[PDB]
Write a protein that binds this ligand. Structure first.
Ligand SMILES: [Cl-]
Length: 780
């Protein structure tokens, strides 16, 4: 029968499942080894196998298709689908045409590029070099699209036959791969100057015509123009910044058009959910993706991925919390609006030299914590590249995969196993809320500036948002580490009504901010919102014309020298505040004039709070960042800002190094630090544990039940994660401490694999302290 969904979980024959998967690229693993690798995968508790189908592998020469391994054992797609169904695994199939994968041309046949070079995307002064990885292709070139349709016509009859709805194992089809214009969208002027794009009345002139009036282009580029065809694409940073942002948005539109063409062809063959991974390889630009699929009525499931370390030892510590909170807050914003299940189809399990289990646990544990409860680990099964098909790794496709090319099991399987068990045993976790009091509000054009690293010529503010916002010392890392879980909203898409769901919104500002955005933020405050804005107020609009509406509304001026980019000339400044002694900040600090002062550098006020209408705004003349110290003034200052604006955390911890992310009846409890944390949690009118403290000896993640029912018993609280429930047996796991506290409403028959060293009965509640080697069973 059917594959459907309820916006939290996929539903197969009307059964809710948690997709818990690994990637096994059949075409890079010996055929002799497939059954072995899939059985180990099942043994680790995976219910799904992901694989690409590579156009250039199954069509090695124009017209010569092989899906049965006539020609090479590993060309046997049919056989791989048959075995996956035989062992009772679901399949996610990603048939491209582009599959990335560190694979020659990202799946695009060499014969195609050699036959039709006219399809190749061009630089502004001529062709790109031909020996670069993933030779960039003009997506909308008719010859390219004609050849893709040829590929889809061959692989989609097979996919169709192995769909869950046709009796097969395939539950999802993914479009292309993180379509990014072949990873060229990171550079303003690398692509694409192909004739179809740039000829008079080409895609560029068409897009301008559809997006803008000439009267708008005149204000925006500050020229006169009597026709759209007079406007050449920008090729360098002498050109108006608005026109370069437009060029960026225009590449994203060609990508959207590409995807729509693929979706329409796929829809002729497929009646299961259709997905896409990380459009454009961007985050804030997902506003364009959302708008495009809404406008074009495309039922595409947005899925995401986590990559943190490339061709070095895996490095996943406290430093990453900003970026992960940001990326998953952004993802959570979009899948909540689209009402599709959150899924990470590529969770890093390879391409780092060594993946240490406590660092892997922190990443893997954070996905469900922040709302991604469907998980595929990439790459799960180590392989080897057939000769001719190498790109990024030469021979090897076993860079610390959970299962090696030799079939060994590596250390990061431990966290992969127990998280699966927990998600399977607690499907209610999938339906849990994320009740953020606080939002970070992102302004998408800033993403583009940060991406390119070009500081506009008279900008008073740095475009290094990796340093000041996203990275290891970023504002967002500070908020994470200050125990402020946050949502992410897009300032252009959000309505004031949506903004008013948040007790507090943080905005990072540069020189320019769109008029509609500057107005909504003022109205947010007017209507009872609490804005925090730094390290300046904008004084320009989206055309870079004077616009200071937010600054006139708040009645404050933020004056100071422009920020410096020469690392030697970046000043250090000590900021005092009530209860705060010389909090270090970096780069120039601005005088905040007006409001009630809350932060000063000696004589000078550098931070203030104002009340406007029903609400308040905190204006900081500096870049607040995550610095760690005994004195810990940065986290203390965040606390003061939330108290100033009356923002109330749903929870308290006695050790502020213990990160808690409340999820209704579950607490995601996180030690991100490489040291022990020990303390108690206050949540939902209770404080626990009461008899012992909650000890996390090292880095790791717990998911603790608070008032969760298991059959006729309720777990009032646990210092250990429930990994399994059978009739009368609950299994608890805590590898971070040898002492667990459990409070139970129900009849406790006993404990397997643990000794009860303490017991209290208060009315209906049995409380036990259990000493255990890392896992114990309660009998009820
Ligand atoms: Cl070979």
């Amino acid at each position: 029968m059917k594959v459907t969904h309820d916006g939290k979980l996929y539903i197969v024959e009307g059964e809710k499942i948690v997709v818990y998967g690994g990637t096994l690229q059949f075409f890079r693993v010996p055929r002799d080894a497939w059954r072995d690798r899939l059985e180990k995968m099942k043994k680790h508790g995976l219910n799904t196998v992901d694989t690409y189908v590579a156009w250039n592998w199954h069509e090695p020469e124009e017209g010569k298709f092989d899906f049965i391994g006539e020609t090479h054992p590993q060309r046997d797609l049919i056989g791989f689908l048959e075995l996956a169904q035989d062992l009772g695994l679901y399949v996610i199939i990603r048939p491209g045409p582009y599959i990335c994968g560190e694979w020659k041309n990202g799946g695009i046949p060499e014969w195609l590029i050699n036959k039709h070079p006219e399809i190749l995307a061009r630089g502004p002064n001529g062709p790109l070099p031909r020996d670069i990885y993933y030779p960039p292709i003009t997506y909308l070139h008719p010859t390219y699209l004609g050849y893709v349709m040829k590929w889809y016509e061959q692989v989609f009859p097979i996919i169709k036959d192995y769909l869950y709805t046709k009796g097969g194992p395939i539950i999802n089809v993914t479009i292309d791969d993180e379509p990014s214009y072949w990873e060229t969208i990171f550079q303003a002027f690398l692509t694409d100057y192909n004739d179809v794009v740039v000829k008079p009345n080409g895609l560029w002139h068409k897009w301008l015509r559809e997006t803008f009036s000439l009267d708008q282009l005149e204000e925006r580029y500050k020229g006169k123009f009597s026709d759209y065809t007079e406007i050449a694409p920008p090729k360098d940073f002498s050109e108006p910044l608005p026109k370069i942002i437009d060029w960026h948005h225009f590449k994203i539109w060609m990508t959207n058009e590409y995807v729509k063409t693929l979706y329409h062809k796929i829809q002729e063959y497929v009646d299961v959910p259709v997905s896409i991974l990380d459009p454009y390889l961007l985050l804030a630009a997902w506003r364009h993706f959302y708008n495009y699929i809404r406008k074009n009525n495309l039922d595409i499931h947005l899925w995401t991925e986590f990559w943190y370390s490339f061709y070095r030892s895996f490095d996943f510590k406290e430093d990453r919390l900003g970026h992960v909170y940001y990326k998953i807050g952004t993802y959570r914003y979009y899948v909540n609006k689209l009402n599709t299940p959150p899924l990470s189809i590529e969770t890093q399990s390879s391409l780092a030299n060594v993946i240490e289990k406590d660092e892997a646990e922190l990443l893997y544990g954070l996905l469900p914590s922040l709302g991604i409860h469907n998980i595929n680990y990439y790459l799960y099964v180590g392989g080897e590249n057939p000769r001719g098909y190498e790109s990024h790794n030469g021979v090897t496709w076993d860079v610390y995969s959970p299962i090696g090319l030799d079939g060994s099991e590596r250390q990061h399987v431990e966290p992969i196993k127990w998280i699966g068990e927990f998600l399977k045993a607690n499907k209610d976790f999938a339906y849990s809320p994320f009740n953020a009091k606080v939002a970070f509000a992102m302004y998408e054009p800033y993403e583009a500036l940060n991406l390119w690293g070009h500081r506009p010529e008279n900008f008073k503010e740095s475009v290094n948002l990796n340093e000041y916002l996203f990275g290891e010392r970023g504002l967002l890392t500070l908020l994470a580490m200050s125990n402020v879980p946050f949502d992410v909203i897009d300032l252009e898409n959000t309505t004031v009504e949506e903004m008013l769901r948040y007790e507090q919104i943080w905005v990072y500002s540069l020189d320019f901010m769109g008029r509609e955005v500057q107005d909504k933020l003022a109205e947010y405050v007017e209507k009872g919102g609490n804005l925090v804005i730094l390290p300046m107020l904008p004084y320009l609009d989206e055309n870079l014309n004077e616009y200071r509406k937010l600054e006139e509304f708040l009645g404050v001026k933020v004056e100071g020298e422009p920020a410096r980019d020469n690392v030697r000339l970046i000043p250090f400044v000590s900021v005092d505040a009530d209860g705060i002694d010389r909090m270090i900040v970096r780069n120039v600090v601005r005088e905040v004039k007006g409001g009630e002062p809350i932060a000063w550098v000696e004589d000078k006020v550098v931070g203030a709070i104002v009340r406007k209408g029903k609400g308040s705004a905190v204006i900081l003349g500096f870049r607040l960042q995550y610095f760690s110290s005994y004195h810990d003034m940065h986290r203390k200052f965040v606390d003061k800002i939330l108290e100033l604006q009356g923002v109330e955390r749903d929870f308290k911890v006695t050790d502020r190094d213990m990160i808690v992310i409340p999820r209704g009846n579950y607490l995601a409890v996180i030690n991100p630090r490489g040291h022990a944390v020990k303390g108690r949690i206050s949540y939902n009118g209770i404080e626990f544990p009461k008899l012992i403290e909650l000890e996390m000896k090292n880095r790791g993640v717990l998911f603790l039940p608070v008032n969760v029912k298991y059959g006729s018993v309720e777990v009032v609280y646990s210092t250990a994660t429930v990994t399994r429930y059978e009739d009368g047996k609950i299994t608890f796991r805590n590898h971070l401490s040898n002492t667990a506290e459990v409070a139970i409403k129900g009849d406790v028959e006993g404990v397997e694999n643990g000794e009860v060293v303490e017991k209290k009965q208060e009315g209906e509640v049995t409380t036990l302290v259990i000493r255990h080697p890392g896992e114990f069973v309660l009998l009820l």
